[PDB]
Structure 1
């Protein structure tokens, strides 16, 4: 996936430029990882697609 399920960060679009300066379209996808998140400790888990910048903050608990 390429959309965070917490902050909604999606891919940015731009260009891939070559040595002869020929420009074609690619995407800059976000770094979407899978987490099995609890809400309270001892609770059941839930699969999310969150980005690593939300993992690095305190947005989830495993």
Structure 2
């Protein structure tokens, strides 16, 4: 839940608000998953931490 290795995405911090509109500091942790994706066309694939946005971008290929 820290940083996906390629686009350099780090968690930002913000405040939760109530119906009474009360502030309280909270956290947003980015969607990153441990997946093993192909790097060279021979079909080898290594476990790296990639965020879901990057996976959707397809910056790492699927095979």
Q: Return 5+ residue gaps in structure 1 as ranges.
A: none
- 1:47 matched residue in structure 2: 47
State the distance in 2 between where 1:5 and 1:56 align: 15
**Cα distance between partner residues in 1 of 2:13 and 2:55:** 24
| 1:4 alignment counterpart | 4
How many residue pairs match? The answer is: 62
Q: What TM-score does the superposition give when structure 2 sets the normalisation length?
A: 0.80
C-alpha distance in structure 2 between counterparts of 1:15 and 1:39, whole Å: 39
TM-score of the superposed pair, with normalisation by structure 1: 0.81
Which aligned runs of 4 or more in structure 1 are off by greater than 6 angstroms?
none
Structure 2 unmatched runs, 5+:
none
Partner of 1:35: 35
**Superposed CA RMSD:** 1.5
Tell me by how many angstroms 1:43 deviates. 4.2
